[PDB]
Amino acid sequence: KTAKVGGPACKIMGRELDLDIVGNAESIAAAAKEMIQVTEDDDTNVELLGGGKRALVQVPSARFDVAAEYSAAPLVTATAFVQAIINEFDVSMYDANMVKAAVLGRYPQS
Amino acid sequence: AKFEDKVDLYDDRGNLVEEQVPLEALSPLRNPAIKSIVQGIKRTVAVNLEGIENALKTAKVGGPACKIMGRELDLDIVGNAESIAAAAKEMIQVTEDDDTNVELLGGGKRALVQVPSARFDVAAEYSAAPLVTATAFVQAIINEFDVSMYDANMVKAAVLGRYPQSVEYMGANIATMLDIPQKLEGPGYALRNIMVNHVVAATLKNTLQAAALSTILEQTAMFEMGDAVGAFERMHLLGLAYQGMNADNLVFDLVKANGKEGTVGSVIADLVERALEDGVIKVEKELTDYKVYGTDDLAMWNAYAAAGLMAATMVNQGAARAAQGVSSTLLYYNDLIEFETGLPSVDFGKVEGTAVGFSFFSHSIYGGGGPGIFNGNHIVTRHSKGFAIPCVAAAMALDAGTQMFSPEATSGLIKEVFSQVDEFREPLKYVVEAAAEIKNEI
Amino acid sequence: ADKLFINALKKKFEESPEEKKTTFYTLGGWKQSERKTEFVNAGKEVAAKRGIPQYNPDIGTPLGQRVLMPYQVSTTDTYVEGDDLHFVNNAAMQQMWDDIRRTVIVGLNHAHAVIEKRLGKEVTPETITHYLETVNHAMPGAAVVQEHMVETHPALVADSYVKVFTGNDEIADEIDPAFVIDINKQFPEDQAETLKAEVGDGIWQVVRIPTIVSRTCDGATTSRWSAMQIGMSMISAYKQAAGEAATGDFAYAAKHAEVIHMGTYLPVRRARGENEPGGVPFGYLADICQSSRVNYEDPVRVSLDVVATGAMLYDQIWLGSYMSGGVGFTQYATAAYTDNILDDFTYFGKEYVEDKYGLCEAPNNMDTVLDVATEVTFYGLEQYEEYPALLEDQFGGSQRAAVVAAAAGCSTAFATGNAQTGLSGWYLSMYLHKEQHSRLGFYGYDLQDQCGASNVFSIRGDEGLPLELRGPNYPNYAMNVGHQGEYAGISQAPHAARGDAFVFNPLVKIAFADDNLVFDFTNVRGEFAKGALREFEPAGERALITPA
Amino acid sequence: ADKLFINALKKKFEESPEEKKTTFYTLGGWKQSERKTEFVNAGKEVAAKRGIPQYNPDIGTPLGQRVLMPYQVSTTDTYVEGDDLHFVNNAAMQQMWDDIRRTVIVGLNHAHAVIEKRLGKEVTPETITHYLETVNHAMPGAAVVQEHMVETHPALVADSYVKVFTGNDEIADEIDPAFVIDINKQFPEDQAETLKAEVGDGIWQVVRIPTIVSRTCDGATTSRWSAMQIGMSMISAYKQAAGEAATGDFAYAAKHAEVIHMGTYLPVRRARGENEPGGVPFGYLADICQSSRVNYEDPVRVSLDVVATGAMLYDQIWLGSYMSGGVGFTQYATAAYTDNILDDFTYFGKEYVEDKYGLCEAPNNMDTVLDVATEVTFYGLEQYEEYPALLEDQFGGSQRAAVVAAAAGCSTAFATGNAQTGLSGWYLSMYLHKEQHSRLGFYGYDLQDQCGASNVFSIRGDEGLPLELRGPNYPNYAMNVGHQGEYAGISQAPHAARGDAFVFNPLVKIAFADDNLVFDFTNVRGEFAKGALREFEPAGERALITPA
Amino acid sequence: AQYYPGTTKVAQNRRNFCNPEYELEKLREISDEDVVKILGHRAPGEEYPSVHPPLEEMDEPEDAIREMVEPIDGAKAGDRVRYIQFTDSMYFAPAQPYVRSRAYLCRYRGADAGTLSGRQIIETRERDLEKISKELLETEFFDPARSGVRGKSVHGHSLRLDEDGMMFDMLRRQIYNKDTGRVEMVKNQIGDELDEPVDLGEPLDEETLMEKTTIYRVDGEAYRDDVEAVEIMQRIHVLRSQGGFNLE
Ligand code: F43
Ligand SMILES: C[C@@H](OP(=O)(O)O)[C@H](NC(=O)CCCCCCCS)C(=O)O
Ligand SMILES: O=S(=O)(O)CCS
Numbered sequence A: 001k002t003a004k005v006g007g008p009a010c011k012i013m014g015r016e017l018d019l020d021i022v023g024n025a026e027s028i029a030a031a032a033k034e035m036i037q038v039t040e041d042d043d044t045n046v047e048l049l050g051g052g053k054r055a056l057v058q059v060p061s062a063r064f065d066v067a068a069e070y071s072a073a074p075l076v077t078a079t080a081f082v083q084a085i086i087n088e089f090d091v092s093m094y095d096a097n098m099v100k101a102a103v104l105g106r107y108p109q110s
Numbered sequence B: 001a002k003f004e005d006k007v008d009l010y011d012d013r014g015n016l017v018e019e020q021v022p023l024e025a026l027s028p029l030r031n032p033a034i035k036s037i038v039q040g041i042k043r044t045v046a047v048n049l050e051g052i053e054n055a056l057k058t059a060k061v062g063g064p065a066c067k068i069m070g071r072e073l074d075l076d077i078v079g080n081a082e083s084i085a086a087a088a089k090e091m092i093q094v095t096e097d098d099d100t101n102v103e104l105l106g107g108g109k110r111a112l113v114q115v116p117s118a119r120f121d122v123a124a125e126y127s128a129a130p131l132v133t134a135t136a137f138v139q140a141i142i143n144e145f146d147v148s149m150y151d152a153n154m155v156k157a158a159v160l161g162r163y164p165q166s167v168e169y170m171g172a173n174i175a176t177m178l179d180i181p182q183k184l185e186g187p188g189y190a191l192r193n194i195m196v197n198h199v200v201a202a203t204l205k206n207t208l209q210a211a212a213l214s215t216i217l218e219q220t221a222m223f224e225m226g227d228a229v230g231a232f233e234r235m236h237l238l239g240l241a242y243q244g245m246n247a248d249n250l251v252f253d254l255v256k257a258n259g260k261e262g263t264v265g266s267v268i269a270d271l272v273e274r275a276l277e278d279g280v281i282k283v284e285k286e287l288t289d290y291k292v293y294g295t296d297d298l299a300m301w302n303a304y305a306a307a308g309l310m311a312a313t314m315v316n317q318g319a320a321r322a323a324q325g326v327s328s329t330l331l332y333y334n335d336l337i338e339f340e341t342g343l344p345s346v347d348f349g350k351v352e353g354t355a356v357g358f359s360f361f362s363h364s365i366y367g368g369g370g371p372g373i374f375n376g377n378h379i380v381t382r383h384s385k386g387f388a389i390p391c392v393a394a395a396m397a398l399d400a401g402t403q404m405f406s407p408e409a410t411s412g413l414i415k416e417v418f419s420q421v422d423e424f425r426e427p428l429k430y431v432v433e434a435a436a437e438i439k440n441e442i
Numbered sequence C, D: 001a002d003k004l005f006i007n008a009l010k011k012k013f014e015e016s017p018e019e020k021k022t023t024f025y026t027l028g029g030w031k032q033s034e035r036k037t038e039f040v041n042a043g044k045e046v047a048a049k050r051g052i053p054q055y056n057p058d059i060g061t062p063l064g065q066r067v068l069m070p071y072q073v074s075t076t077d078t079y080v081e082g083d084d085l086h087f088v089n090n091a092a093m094q095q096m097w098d099d100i101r102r103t104v105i106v107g108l109n110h111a112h113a114v115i116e117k118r119l120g121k122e123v124t125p126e127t128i129t130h131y132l133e134t135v136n137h138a139m140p141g142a143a144v145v146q147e148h149m150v151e152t153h154p155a156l157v158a159d160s161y162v163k164v165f166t167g168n169d170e171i172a173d174e175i176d177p178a179f180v181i182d183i184n185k186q187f188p189e190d191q192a193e194t195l196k197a198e199v200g201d202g203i204w205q206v207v208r209i210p211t212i213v214s215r216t217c218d219g220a221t222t223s224r225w226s227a228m229q230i231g232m233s234m235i236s237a238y239k240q241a242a243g244e245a246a247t248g249d250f251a252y253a254a255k256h257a258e259v260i261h262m263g264t265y266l267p268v269r270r271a272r273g274e275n276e277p278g279g280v281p282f283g284y285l286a287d288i289c290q291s292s293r294v295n296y297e298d299p300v301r302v303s304l305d306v307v308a309t310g311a312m313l314y315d316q317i318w319l320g321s322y323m324s325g326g327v328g329f330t331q332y333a334t335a336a337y338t339d340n341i342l343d344d345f346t347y348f349g350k351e352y353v354e355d356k357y358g359l360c361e362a363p364n365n366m367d368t369v370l371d372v373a374t375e376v377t378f379y380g381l382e383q384y385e386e387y388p389a390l391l392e393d394q395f396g397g398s399q400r401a402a403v404v405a406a407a408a409g410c411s412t413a414f415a416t417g418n419a420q421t422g423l424s425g426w427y428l429s430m431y432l433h434k435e436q437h438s439r440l441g442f443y444g445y446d447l448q449d450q451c452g453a454s455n456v457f458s459i460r461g462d463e464g465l466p467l468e469l470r471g472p473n474y475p476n477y478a479m480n481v482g483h484q485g486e487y488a489g490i491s492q493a494p495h496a497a498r499g500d501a502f503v504f505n506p507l508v509k510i511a512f513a514d515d516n517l518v519f520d521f522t523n524v525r526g527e528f529a530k531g532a533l534r535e536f537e538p539a540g541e542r543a544l545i546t547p548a
Numbered sequence E: 001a002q003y004y005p006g007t008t009k010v011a012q013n014r015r016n017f018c019n020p021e022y023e024l025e026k027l028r029e030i031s032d033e034d035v036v037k038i039l040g041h042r043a044p045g046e047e048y049p050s051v052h053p054p055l056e057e058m059d060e061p062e063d064a065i066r067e068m069v070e071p072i073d074g075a076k077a078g079d080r081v082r083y084i085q086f087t088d089s090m091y092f093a094p095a096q097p098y099v100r101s102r103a104y105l106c107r108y109r110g111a112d113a114g115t116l117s118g119r120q121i122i123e124t125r126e127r128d129l130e131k132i133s134k135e136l137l138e139t140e141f142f143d144p145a146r147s148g149v150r151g152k153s154v155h156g157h158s159l160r161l162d163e164d165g166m167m168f169d170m171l172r173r174q175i176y177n178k179d180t181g182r183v184e185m186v187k188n189q190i191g192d193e194l195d196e197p198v199d200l201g202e203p204l205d206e207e208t209l210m211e212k213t214t215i216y217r218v219d220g221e222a223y224r225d226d227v228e229a230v231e232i233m234q235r236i237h238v239l240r241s242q243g244g245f246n247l248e
C-alpha cells in the first residue's frame, strides 16, 4: 500500500498497490496451501492467526526428504503466497514484481 | 495426480520399458529412486587413506605446497586399513546393522563411506557426512597406533585440512560430491553445486546416464529453490521427463535421425516437425512466405524444445568428440529456433542467455574454464533453471580427450568411490523402474 | 539544430562527420599522441629506476594505426585523450568511490530511546549538539575517555566528520547548523516537503570515515569504525559508565539495528563485505547522484548524470578492477558519458514522449514499451549509419548497445513513470539492435540480455525484483560490462519525469546533499572532466608524513 | 649486562626504573607533547577550512595527566611518541600491508602443460623470458593486442611487476635474471638447499599488482588482476588466437588451480574476500617476514621480528580498523615490538632452555611445557614487579599478558622444536599470570585463553589444528587483541630453533625474498621506525595527477 | 525450414547463408596449400598433430549415443582443435557476425561458433577446419576489401574505409594493389609474414556489395522498413515477457 519494500527506509514512489489481503486471508491461505502441499493428506499445515493478519505454515516433510538442506521452507512458502496473492486480485504482470518484493525483500540482490 | 500428463519411458538403449506413466511418478517429490539418489549424495564420503598416510609421513597438510618441517609421522595406515575402517564404522553407525556402509577400495588405499540416514533426519543439512566421517577416521587412526596427545592434531590436519581457519576443508583427504553450504549462490542451491566432471566421472562417461543424473540433480534443486512450485511445477517436471529421462524416446529418436550427417540446424527442423505433428504447436498467422507458430501449451512446447536441444548437443559435440562446442549449441539452437518459428526458445531465453555467458567464460581471459568445471551453482551457468547444465554433462561425456581440466584431472577420487554406487552410476535405470513401480499410486 | 555530438566529432577528425572514408597508417603510431609519448618516456624511467623492464611500446601490437581520439566529457567543453578517464589516472573517479565507500547512515532513534527508557536520562537539541561536537572530534580517530591514547593526525583525516538531518524543521533549527544537512536549503520546495515527510521526526547521522583508512582497509570497515566512535561519543556526551551493559545496546543499534550500508555483502564466489560496489543497488546509486535536486527541470540531464555515476563506478572500478583488472574497461564506460551521444539520443526520446503522450501519461504496459523503445532504438542506430565518424568513435558493439538501449529504456520510463517497463524497453532495444546490424556486443554481452525479457516481470525467488532493488549482485547482472550504470539511469528516469525527490531511499538521497563531500555529486560529469585535467584534489594522500 | 629494556625506561622517565613514586598533574596536559601540539594546531586549521569542528583537546577527558611516553622501536635506536606508530600516521605500516595485499603466487606448471599438450607449442627458458618481458609491460595496466586501448600511467604503477623462481638452478640461470628471485643469492646455503628441494622443477610467478589499485579496491582484486594480465601475456608471447577455447584453461589455472592467495576468504559475520588480513594463517605470516634468511644465527631475533610483523598487521590494521576502527589498538601491538621488553624475556627463556635441554632437545611433552612456560612466566612477571617504570610503561594488563605469554610460548617451542607444545605453554602462562596478580587482560581478553588448554591438542572439527595452520579465523581467536601476532611468533619459534628455511609454506617464503618490494621484509622493526620518522616513501600516491 | 522472416534482400540473404541447400556463390579460387598458409596452424608438408590417440586405439565402453553419432574425420584421427576468425565491415560486407554463427551451425558438423561485434570465429578438428575454411574464403561469405581473416587485433568492423575502399587492419594482413586492383594476403590470420602472398582477387563493386549484404542500414535497406521482421522480433520479446511471469 505504501510501496515500502526492500529494506529499512526504502520506498518506490509511484509503485503503491492497495490490495485487501487481510480481508481475503482465508482464500489466499487456502490457495497457498494447495501449492505448498505435496498431497492432500500430508503433514502440510497452514493456519490463520490474529484474525488473518498472520499465517502459521508447516511445509510438508516430504519436500525435505529430497532436499539438501532447509531453505525449501521459506522459498516454497514465499512463492506460494506471492502467487496466491497475485491470483486473488488478478495482479498485473506490470505490478506483480511489487508483491514479490513485499514478501521476500531485496533477495537476490541481497 | 495434479496434472493429466502421461509419458512413455525407455531404457538407455532406446527400448520401451513402461507405457503411459503419470508425469508425477518421475517427480523428485514422489519418486523413491530420486529420493535414494539425493539421500545417497547427501551421505556419501570418499576417504583417501593413502592420501592421509602420505600427508602424515611428509607433514604436508593444510593446502597446496604447505609442509610443517619436524611434524612427520610415519603410520602404516594402508597396511592396517581393515582394522581402521572397522573401528571408524563402529563410530559412524547409530546401531549395528543400520544403513551405515564402510568398504575398502584399491587394496585399502580408499574407502567408500555412507553415513547412516538417521543422522540426517535429525540434522538441518548435509555436513554431518564429511564431519562425522572425518572425525571417526581421525579417532580410528589415533587409536590404531596409539598416536599421542602431542601428535594427534597432525592426523586431524591430514584428514580435514586447514578447516576452521579456512572456511572450506582446504587440503582435506576426504571428498564429497556436495560442497560446503556457505558456498551456495542462493538458498536451495546445494544440489546445483556439483561439478559437471564429478557427474560424468560417477556415470563412467555414459552419455544418457550423465544427462539423466545431471537433470535429476538440477530439477530436484528447482523444487528446493521453490521454482518448481505453483504455476511453474509442470514446466519443470516436463523438462525433467523430456530433456533428462528421454520421455517418449524423443531425445533418442532425434539423435538417431541426425547422428550420421546432421547438424544443430537439422535437429531443429526435425523437432519443429515433431511438435507440429504432435499438436504441441500450430500455425497462428501467415506473413510473407513465413509461417508464425503459436502454442496453447507453453510448458509442453518448452519440453519438446528442450529435448531437441539435448539431441542437438549430442549430435554437434558427439560429431566433434570435443565438448567445447556445447556453449555454441546451447546458444544457436535457441537463437535459430526462435527465428525459425516465432515462438520463445528453451526456458524463455534463459538457456540462450546462459549460453552467451558460458561461451564467453569458456573462451576468454576473464574466468570460467573448460565445460567440466561448470555446475548449476556457478555464477556463469546458474541462470537457466535446469535446462542448460544437463547438456554440458552430455557434451563432457562425449569428449575423447580435448580437455586439460577433464574428469580424469579433477574427479579421480570421486570416480573410484561414487561410480561404485549403482543408482549414482545408472540413474536412468533406477528412476524409470521406480516410476513404473509407483505408477498406480500417483 | 546540429545533433548534440557534432561538435565532438568535428574536434576528433579532419573530415566532416558524414564522410565515409579516411586515411590510416601514416600518423606515426603512438607518436601522434601527447599522452602515449608521456607514457613511453615514463616507462623508460620506471624500468631504469627499478631494474625491471616495464611499459614498452614495442611489445605486442603497435597502437595508433588510426587516430587516437580525444573525448568530450558530455555537458562540458573539456576534451581529453581516453587515458585521462581511466580510473587509475583520474583522481576524481577514485575519490567518487572513496566518498561512497567511507559513508554510512546511522539512526539516532533507538539510541535516544536507550537514553530515556533504559538509562533514564533526557535527550534535547542541546544534548544532540554536544554529542555532535564530541563525535566530530572522535570520528576521525581521536580520544575522549582514556589516558595515554595515541591518535590519528587531524590533517590526514580532515575529510572525516558526522552531520545529522531530520524532517522536523524546528529541531533542525535548534541543533548547531555546522552539523546539519538542511533539507530546506539543499532541495527545491516540492522535494523538500516530500523528503521531510519521509523522515518525520526521525533523526539520522551521516557518518564519513577517513579516505586514508578506507583505502588502507575496505568498505566493511566503514560501519564498524562509525559504530566505535558513535559508541565512545555516546559514553562521553551522555556521562554513562565507560562500558556497562547498556553500552552493548548502542553497539548493536549502530552496527545492525539502525544502520544503512551503501552496499550489502556478497556471496563467496565474489566474496566481499559491505560497502563494496557490487552491493550498491541501482536505486541507491540514483539517490547518491545529486543531479535530481539541481537539474530537476530537465529529467534527461538528471537521468544521464546518474548513468555517468554508475557507468564509471560499476564498469571501470567494479567490473574493470575488483572483478577483473589490467588495462580494464574505461571506454566501455566513457561511451555513456562522452561526446554528448547518449544525450542526443535521450533528448530525442524525451521529446518524442512529451509530444505523443505527455511525460508519465502513457499507459504502463507493453504497448507503450513497443512503441517508445522501438522508435528510440531506430533513432540511435540511424545516427551511427548516417555519421561514419560516430560509428568509428563508439567502435565496440557493446558500447553502442548500452548507449542505444539506455536511451530507449530511459525514454520508455519517461512515458510510463515506471522503471519496470523502462527495463523491458532496454531488452527490446537489444533484440532489435542485434537483428538490425547482425551483431550486438562482446562474446558474453547479452547473457543478461537474453534472460532479460523473461526476467523483467518474473516473481520467482532469484528472478523477480523491481529494477530499483536490483544491483550488480542480481544473478544475471553479476558479470558483464555495459549494463549496470545504464540500469541505474533507467531506475532514475521515471522518478525524474515524475519529479520525485528520490528513487528508492530518501535517507541515501539526503545523505549526499552535502558540500563537505570531497567529490561534488551535483555535477558528476564536470568532476570527471576536472580529474581528467589533473585539477581535482583528492583526500587520503600521505604527503604530510613522507619526505620532501 | 643490563636487562634489555633499561635504556628505554631511562629515556622515558626522570626517575630510576626501580623507583615506586612519581609526580603527576603538573605536566601541562597535552602541552607536554610535540605531537599533541601539532595535532591541536592541525585540528584548528581543519575546522576553520571546512566549517565543521574536528580535533579539539577539550572534548572529553584531558590527556597527559601522566607522562606521555616515547617508545623505542625494539632493535633500533629510534624513539618516538606512540602516535607515530599508529598505522594511519605511518606509511611504512600501510605499505607493509599493501605489499602483502597486492601479492599473489601463481604457478606456471599447469600453464606450461596447456602450452605443450593442448596447443602443441614448446616451452623453454627463452620462451619464458619472452613471456616475462611481455607480462612486465602488461601487468601494471598496459596493452598488447587491441587497437585504441587507453592505459595506466606507467609512473603511477611503477611498483607492479612479475618475477619467477624455481628449484632447478640451471633453468633459473637461463631465464633473464632481471625477472628471477635467485634462491642461492637470497638464502644461506642450507636453507637454499631445503627450499630448492621443496620447489624441485616447479616454476612459480610472484605477481605484485599496483598499490594504487589495491588501495582503491580490495585484496580480492589481486588474483583477478594478476590473472587477466597473465592471460593477455600468454596470448601475446606464445602467439595464440586472442580468445579461443584454450584461453579459458589459462584463466582457470591462474585464478584457481595453481594460485596461492596470501589470505583465504572469511565467513559472513566478518565477510571479506581473499588477501585480507583475517585470512592469512600464522605460518604464512611467519614465512612472509624475511628475518629467517638474514638473522638465522639468532632464533630469538627471527621469532620476535615475526611477532612485530603480526602484532602490527593483526592488531593495528586488522582488529583495530577492519574489525573495529577509531583511535584503535596501537599500544596493544606496540607492547610487543617496543622498549626491548619482549626481547629481554625471550632471550632469558632461550638461555634457560639452552642450558637445561639444548635447543630442540627437550622431550615433546607436558613435563617440558610445565617446566619452561612456568619458569619464563615467572621471570617476566618478576620484571614488572621489580621495575615500577616497566609496569607503568606496559600499563594495560592485556599488553603484559601477551608479552609474558609470548616469551613463555616461544621458549617452550625452542625446547621441544614443536609449535603445539609452545602453544600449550602460552595458555599455562595466562593461567599462572591471572593467579599471580588477580587480573589478566581486558574484559574479554581470555575468551580464547580459557578455551585454550583444552583446544591445544583437540582433534575435533572446529577445534583441532596444528598452530601453523591456525590464524585470525580460527574460531576462538576471531575477536581479540593481544594474541594473533604472538601466535605467529610461536609458530616461527620451533622452526627458528631448528634452523628450518620455512614454517608452513616454502613458496610464500621465497615470494617475499625480493628487494623490488617497497617495504623491506628482512627488517620489519627497522621499517616501522623509518615510517615513524616520516622517512618512508610509499607507493600508490596521486601527486603526479593532481594540482602542483 | 524457413530460417528468417522479412521481405528485403537483406532478409533473403540471411536465409540463403543458413540454407544448406543454397549453393554459396564461389567468387575466387584458392589452393589447399594457400588455405593452410592463411590458417597458420601447420607448415606445408607437416603432418596433422594429435591431441589424443585415434578413436579406434581407444576401445571405449558401450554408449548408444556415441554409437549413433558419426565422428568427423578429424575427431577419428585425434586432430588438435584449431580456428578461423573473420571480421566484417558494417559498410556492406556480405556476411556479418550472427549471420555466420547461425549459418555455420546449420551447414557444418561438430562446430563451436562464437559471435562478437568485431570478429566471428569457428573452432573444429584440424583437417575439417581446412575444408570449411576453403569454402569460407572462396565464396560470397568473403570480400577481400570488406572482410578480413584475423585471429587477433581485429579492430575495423565499425571504422571508416580507407581511400581504396579497404577496411582498416592494424596489422595490414590484406593489401590492395593500386596498380592492379587486386588484393593480396601478405600475412597469415595471426599476422605473420607469408613466404609468398596469396591472391584474393578483386574487391566486389558497390552495386554487387548492395546486392549481397546481410546488414540493414538507412543507406541500404533499413530494418525499420522490414516491418514483418520487426514484428517477429517484437513478438518474441512479448512472448518471452509473458512466459517468464506466469507461463501464459
Ligand atoms: C583478447 C580479447 C579476448 C578477451 O578475453 N579479452 C580481449 C582483450 C581484452 C584486454 C585488451 C588489452 C590489450 O590489448 O592487451 C582488455 C583491456 C582487458 C584487460 N585484460 O585489461 C579488454 N579486452 Ni576486449 N575490450 C574492448 C572491446 C572489445 C571489442 C573490440 C571490437 C573492435 O572492433 O575493436 C572486442 C569484442 C567485440 O568484438 O565486440 C574485444 C575483444 C577482446 N578483448 C579480445 C581481443 C580482440 C582483438 O584481438 O583485437 N574487446 C570493446 O568493444 C570496447 C572497449 C574495449 C575494452 C577497453 C576499454 O574499455 O577501454 C577492452 C577490454
Ligand atoms: C565468472 C567469475 O570468475 P570464476 O569463473 O569464478 O573464475 C567471476 N568473474 C567475473 O564475473 C568477471 C567479470 C568482469 C570481467 C568480464 C567483463 C566482460 S568484458 C569471479 O571472478 O568471481
Ligand atoms: O572478446 S571477448 O568478447 O571475449 C572480450 C571482450 S573485452
Ligand SMILES: O=S(=O)(O)CCS
Pocket: C243, D442, D443, D444
Ligand atoms: O573495557 S573493555 O575490556 O571492554 C575494552 C578494552 S579496549
Ligand SMILES: [Mg+2]
Pocket: B249, B253
Ligand atoms: Mg522407436
Ligand SMILES: [Mg+2]
Pocket: B266, B269, B270
Ligand atoms: Mg530432417
Ligand SMILES: [Mg+2]
Pocket: C518, C520
Ligand atoms: Mg570541487
Ligand SMILES: [Mg+2]
Pocket: E029, E030, E031, E032
Ligand atoms: Mg580447388
Ligand SMILES: [Zn+2]
Pocket: C214, C215, C216, C217, C218, D214, D215, D216, D217, D218
Ligand atoms: Zn582498499
